[PDB]
Write a protein that binds this ligand. Sequence first.
Ligand SMILES: Nc1ncnc2c1ncn2[C@@H]1O[C@H](COP(=O)(O)OP(=O)(O)O)[C@@H](O)[C@H]1O
Ligand SMILES: Nc1ncnc2c1ncn2[C@@H]1O[C@H](COP(=O)(O)OP(=O)(O)O)[C@@H](O)[C@H]1O
Ligand SMILES: [Mg+2]
Ligand SMILES: [Mg+2]
Lengths: 454, 454
Amino acid sequence: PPSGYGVLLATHDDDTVDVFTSGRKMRLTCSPNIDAASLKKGQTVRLNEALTVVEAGTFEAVGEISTLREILADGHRALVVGHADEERVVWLADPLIPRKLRPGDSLLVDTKAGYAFERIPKAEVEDLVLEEVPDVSYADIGGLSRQIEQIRDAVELPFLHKELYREYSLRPPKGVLLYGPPGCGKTLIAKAVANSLAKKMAKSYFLNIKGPELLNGETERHIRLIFQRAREKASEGTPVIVFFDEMDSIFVVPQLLSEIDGVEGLENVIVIGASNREDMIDPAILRPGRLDVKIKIERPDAEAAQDIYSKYLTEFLPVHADDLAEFDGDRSACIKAMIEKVVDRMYAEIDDNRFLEVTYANGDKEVMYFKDFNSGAMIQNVVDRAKKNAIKSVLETGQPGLRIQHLLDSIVDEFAENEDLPNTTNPDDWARISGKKGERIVYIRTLASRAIDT
Amino acid sequence: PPSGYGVLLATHDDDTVDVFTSGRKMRLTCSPNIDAASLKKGQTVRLNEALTVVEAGTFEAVGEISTLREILADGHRALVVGHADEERVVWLADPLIPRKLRPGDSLLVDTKAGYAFERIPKAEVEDLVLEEVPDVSYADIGGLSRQIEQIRDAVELPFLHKELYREYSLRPPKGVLLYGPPGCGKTLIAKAVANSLAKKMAKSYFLNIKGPELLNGETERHIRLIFQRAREKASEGTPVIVFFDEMDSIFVVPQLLSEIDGVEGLENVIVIGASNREDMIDPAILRPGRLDVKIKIERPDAEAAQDIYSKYLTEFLPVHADDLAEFDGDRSACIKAMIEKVVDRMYAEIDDNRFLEVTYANGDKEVMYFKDFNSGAMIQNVVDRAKKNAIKSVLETGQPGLRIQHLLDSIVDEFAENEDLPNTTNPDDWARISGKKGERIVYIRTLASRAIDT
Ligand SMILES: Nc1ncnc2c1ncn2[C@@H]1O[C@H](COP(=O)(O)OP(=O)(O)O)[C@@H](O)[C@H]1O
Ligand SMILES: Nc1ncnc2c1ncn2[C@@H]1O[C@H](COP(=O)(O)OP(=O)(O)O)[C@@H](O)[C@H]1O
Ligand SMILES: [Mg+2]
Ligand SMILES: [Mg+2]
């Protein structure tokens, strides 16, 4: 019994069906065997040489993919765009007509029959818009108590006391800019605020996107998908943090602005952005309604560095026997001392810590030290090289443990490693140095000895 | 039993029909059952293998989409453009041949048949060109009385006194430029004038488009769609304000200039444009016939700030009991005196209010204070920070209500938050400061302390 196929389009009271077979739409009668009521829109039906619907199958599983623009008002049809930007209306097959179809989704289609059969999930798209459980907590962050309070007030506080906000006629902020010199805590602070917020659901969503991930379709589609997924998770009533890390590279702006304005309706979606370059930011992003709350994560001072070191010099690190000698086996007092020694030597104004020499337009010259260019990322890197020198010490001398001297040697080795490179400094620093003097910087020099343009 | 299909093209005196079936154009006989006079252009018809019309169906509801260029003279044909820029003429089916089909509308089409069956609305084009009831009124806007008279004289007055305008041979203005530093009221006035003019109808339309919306089809298709809708609403005889907010980004201009010039015939359509960057504006937009009326929204002086505070420090805000003591429970007097104290504070030349230092080309230096860089947005954000600090004090101290100190602390906090970044300052300020001094500005810095590019 040699037989052909077609796509089912419509079922009537007549007990006949409209089927797309052999490249054209025809009305065909069903065999008495098959029940015409149990058939479904878009289902592949089997035929014979009299062209009678003998059997019902499943939905077509291979074909063209189109990107869904919208579902039309009637609910049955959808507007989709193909590879050549050809825009077409098609019927939604039964597996679509929870989860909700949204603008940006990829649908398998037969454009000859005019049907859309399935939603094809795409990784890359999924792993772009994926929510993550945040790693970091406020206890992992050192030296930023002030800024943790600002981010709490902006993000966390509105949700906890909704009615007290309504009482004082205060509309909560909805966008945050983290900004400042690199390696100082903006990624950490953003994850930590998402973490403490999730912990106060004792059911929370945190989308982490880095700048480079956007430039990977074209940036329009990236932003459209990201905010559409935020829209999805927002429907549940849950708080949704959409974090744009490493935003430096971006400034593309008009869709980001347009999408942030678009989520103003939704009271539970918050946008946080992070930028190393305050100066290159498009002012549009910082206007009322968008990134309202501007939180500056600065470089650490001596007191902050003691806190940051405490996160990486724990008492679960092997300590050398000579170091423990001076504190008679008490590792709490040994380390807290070791952290105070390593910080004092990092932050002191000695000829060994000299880093830059600045020359101003009036002929004056000032010398900057490591104290003025430190970061949390640099403190951690100093600890990691100290650990690696202890691991080398184990192997080379036989004696286990981390000495004070491994850290102290690691400071100047770490700063010498970055006493050339462009990663180490930032316009916020030159602005700050120039500012305090009140003069323009005309010549910079490191102290090996190298020069840097102004 | 098994039957095919086709599209109806024309009906004759012969009681026969032209039908597009199976990729070809046919003359077919209607069955005796069918009344050929009641059939309609572009309608789907069922057949048999004798190829005789047995039933009238509905119109095709899936397929290609094209953008309508125009309707031809005969009234029955449309010139449409498909996805590959393939322009074609097609017949209009009955449901099109109320409302008005216009250039820009998306039409469902079968190009092989040569027919357009339906106008499919698009969500994103519909939300672009949607009118809105304006939120803001003149009572909500503080400190801009002159500018409110100027916007009234341009937009409102022509419509109220048409025959008095005719008497003096005065042609009414076509368009308004709102321009000045950011955060000072330009958006507010534009919707306040749409509001007061809608109130003088006791039907009027107000389209609100932001620059960013245009950049996200191509930029000049956006502008065609907007002005084509403005024509649709102008046909009613009522006023139509088309507001282009946040145009800083734009300057593309040619289609804007062309569409403003084209709409000058319709004297019930007004175009308002807002810009923060006076200096970057293409002079073409400001030439006679287009944005004739230039209204400058400046930064508020002390007395303007009194009026702006009063919009956000109302006596329906909880006020602390200690603050209510000194006016014996009188809230009007308590708040009026609170507003005078916070204003006097923020407009003072105290060391706490030092903002920037401007160095000139002759060596002279001038200290700029907060008063010189204030705005309506900053006043409101100072109020919102105080409201937040009240909310925190009730949680922390138990004692409800907002203290004067919450406002006063909030001033320096809000300025410190924005001391660093862009869009707190603007080229109009340097013009003003360089102007009043009569010297070029060579170096600038904030007073943390930090320099700016100039
Ligand atoms: N304040 C801090 N406390 C503890 N660790 C820090 C701190 N700042 C930076 N670090 C360390 O250095 C890394 C730098 O990351 P990040 O916080 O993202 O800086 P940035 O925001 O400049 O990229 C962190 O992953 C962390 O290991
Ligand atoms: N003159 C004013 N009176 C009252 N509030 C103002 C005034 N100017 C600005 N604001 C406040 O600050 C915000 C900035 O508004 P807007 O008028 O859009 O400034 P822009 O000129 O930058 O478009 C407004 O939402 C409003 O809350
Ligand atoms: Mg980071
Ligand atoms: Mg505005």
